Write a protein that holds these residues in place. Structure first.
Motif, PDB file in Angstrom:
ATOM      1  N   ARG A 161       0.819  -1.206   0.000  1.00 54.94           N
ATOM      2  CA  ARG A 161       0.000   0.000   0.000  1.00 54.94           C
ATOM      3  C   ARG A 161       0.858   1.263   0.000  1.00 54.94           C
ATOM      4  NH1 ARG A 161      -2.154   0.936   3.928  1.00 54.94           N
ATOM      5  NH2 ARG A 161      -4.057   2.047   3.274  1.00 54.94           N
ATOM      6  N   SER A 166     -11.968   2.041  -2.019  1.00 51.36           N
ATOM      7  CA  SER A 166     -11.449   3.189  -1.281  1.00 51.36           C
ATOM      8  C   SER A 166     -10.157   3.610  -1.969  1.00 51.36           C
ATOM      9  CB  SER A 166     -11.173   2.828   0.177  1.00 51.36           C
ATOM     10  OG  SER A 166     -10.795   3.987   0.897  1.00 51.36           O
ATOM     11  N   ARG A 200      -6.589   5.617  -2.883  1.00 50.73           N
ATOM     12  CA  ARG A 200      -5.344   6.047  -2.264  1.00 50.73           C
ATOM     13  C   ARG A 200      -4.340   6.514  -3.315  1.00 50.73           C
ATOM     14  NH1 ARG A 200      -1.700   2.522  -2.241  1.00 50.73           N
ATOM     15  NH2 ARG A 200      -3.135   0.757  -1.932  1.00 50.73           N
TER      16      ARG A 200
HETATM   17  C1  TQ9 Z   1      -9.139  -1.845  -1.642  1.00 49.06           C
HETATM   18  C2  TQ9 Z   1      -8.384  -2.010  -0.344  1.00 49.06           C
HETATM   19  O1  TQ9 Z   1      -8.076  -3.126   0.028  1.00 49.06           O
HETATM   20  C3  TQ9 Z   1      -8.045  -0.791   0.505  1.00 49.06           C
HETATM   21  C4  TQ9 Z   1      -7.379   0.379  -0.278  1.00 49.06           C
HETATM   22  C5  TQ9 Z   1      -6.117   0.823   0.420  1.00 49.06           C
HETATM   23  O2  TQ9 Z   1      -6.180   1.814   1.201  1.00 49.06           O
HETATM   24  O3  TQ9 Z   1      -5.052   0.187   0.194  1.00 49.06           O
END
Ligand code: TQ9
Ligand code: TQ9
Lengths: 146, 93, 93, 146
Positions: free
Chosen positions: A36, B21, B23
Motif C-alpha cells: 500500500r 477506497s 489512495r
Molecule cells: C481496496 C483495499 O483493500 C483498501 C485500499 C487501500 O487503502 O489500500
C-alpha cells in the motif's frame, strides 16, 4: 450550581486518550495482496494531527491478524479511567466488515468488541472512535456531473 | 440504569458500504488526507460530526481517479459516517 | 466537476448493524417515538446530526425491554446514524 | 455580495419535499411474518411530525415487495426541482440490508438506487433521507449498568 445539560461528552479528563494507528503496507505473498504505497504518508499525517489534539499516539506497522487482535485486546485491558476517549485508526486492504492483517483478515467486529461498554469498563460512557481507511468492497462510483 | 454495549461508538469509514477506497501513492489516501486537513482546521471550532461532514464534501468534490485502465478511471468517492454516539463531541473544552 | 452518485444520502437506522429493533405495541417503536419527540423539540433549533444524536441518547437511556422470555428480557438498543451527506442540514431557514 | 459559504444545504426551495411513509403491519401467511402491532402509532406520529416541518407526507400501508419498488421508482421519476429534499420512512420487518414487503423482501439498495445522483437528477446535490425502523439482524444488546 446552575442548570446542567449533558449534551456533550466530558473531554476534560487529565488525558484525551490513546490514538492507536495500525499501518499495514507490506503483506505476505500467499495473501495475494500488494504493497500500500503512500500509506506511510497517511500514518505520519495522522500522528501529527492527533498529536496536536493531545492524544497519546502509538503507531504500529505491518501487523499480522494475530498481532492486531492481541494489540487491541491488550489496549482494551489498560486502565482508561483518566482518559476522555479512545481512537483507533486502521490503514490496510479490506472488504465489507473486514480489515486485513499482513497474513490474513480480521473481522472489524472482533476488534471493536474488546471495547464494548461491558468489556472495557474504563471506557464505558466515553467516545470510542474507529477510523477506517480500507475498501469495503469492489464497487466503483462513476459519479455525476454537477 | 443501563446503556447499550454498542453505544458510544463512532465509525468513520473512508468509503460507502460495498465500495472501493482510493489512495494516492504520493499524497496518501483521499480520506485520510481530507480528515487530517479538516481536523487541523476545525478541531478547535466544530463539533466532530460537522468536521466529518466537511471531510465528506472535500473527498466528494475535490477528488477523482485517473487511470490508464478505463475500468478504474474517473471514479469518485464518498466517505461514510456511522455514529452510535450519544452526545456531541468537541476535542476542546 | 462531478460528485459521487452515493453522496447526499443519510440513513437513520433504528438500530445497530446485525441487531434487533424494539417496538412497543401501544407506544410504537422506541426509535420512531424518540425521533419524533426530538424533531418536535429541536427541528427549529439544531442541525440534523445533532438532533439524531439526541435520538441516540434517548433510545439508549430511556428504553429497556421487558419479556416473560428471559432471552428477550432487559435488552437495550442504540440507533445507528449513517451519513453520506456533504453539508449540514437545518429544517428551517 | 459578502463572503458566501456553502456549509449547509439550501432548504429554502418553494417546497421542503416529499416524505413517503411505508407502513407494513399485515404480512402474507407464507412469509411467516407476524403483524406489527403499534406500527400505526409510528405512522401517525411521523405524519404529524413531518407535516409540521412542511413536508408533503404520503402514507402507504401494507405494500407488497412489488408495490414498494414501483412506488419508489415512480417517486424518483417525479420532478423534484422545486423541492429542497426527499424523505422516505420504512416501517416493517427486516434483516441486515433488507426491508420486507407484505409478501417478501426488498433489498434496501434497490430502493435507494432509484435516487442516486445520476438516476434522479432533480435531487442531485439535495439531501435524501431514509429512516428505517426494522431489524437488521437478531442480535440482542444485553447492555451494561452505568
Ligand atoms: C481496496 C483495499 O483493500 C483498501 C485500499 C487501500 O487503502 O489500500
Ligand atoms: C425484527 C423486525 O423484523 C423489525 C421489528 C419491527 O419493527 O417490527
Amino acid at each position: 450550581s446552575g442548570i446542567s445539560l449533558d449534551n456533550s461528552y466530558k473531554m476534560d479528563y487529565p488525558e484525551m486518550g490513546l490514538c492507536i494507528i495500525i499501518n499495514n503496507k507490506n503483506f505476505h505473498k500467499s495473501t495475494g495482496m500488494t504493497s500500500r504505497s503512500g500509506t506511510d504518508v497517511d500514518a505520519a499525517n495522522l500522528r501529527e494531527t492527533f498529536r496536536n489534539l493531545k492524544y497519546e499516539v502509538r503507531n504500529k506497522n505491518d501487523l499480522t491478524r494475530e498481532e492486531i487482535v492481541e494489540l487491541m485486546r491488550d489496549v482494551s485491558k489498560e486502565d482508561h479511567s483518566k482518559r476522555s476517549s479512545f481512537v483507533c485508526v486502521l490503514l490496510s486492504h479490506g472488504e465489507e466488515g473486514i480489515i486485513f492483517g499482513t497474513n490474513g483478515p480480521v473481522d472489524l467486529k472482533k476488534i471493536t468488541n474488546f471495547f464494548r461498554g461491558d468489556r472495557c469498563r474504563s471506557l464505558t460512557g466515553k467516545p470510542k472512535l474507529f477510523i477506517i481507511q480500507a475498501c469495503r468492497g469492489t464497487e466503483l462510483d462513476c459519479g455525476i456531473e454537477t | 440504569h443501563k446503556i447499550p454495549v454498542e453505544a458510544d461508538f463512532l465509525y468513520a469509514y473512508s468509503t460507502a458500504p460495498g465500495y472501493y477506497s482510493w489512495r494516492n501513492s504520493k499524497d496518501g489516501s483521499w480520506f485520510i488526507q481530507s480528515l487530517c486537513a479538516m481536523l487541523k482546521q476545525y478541531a478547535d471550532k466544530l463539533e466532530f460530526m460537522h468536521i466529518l461532514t466537511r471531510v465528506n464534501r472535500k473527498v466528494a468534490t475535490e477528488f477523482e481517479s485517473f487511470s490508464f485502465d478505463a475500468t478504474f478511471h474517473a471514479k469518485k468517492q464518498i466517505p461514510c459516517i456511522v455514529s452510535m454516539l450519544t452526545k456531541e463531541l468537541y476535542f476542546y473544552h
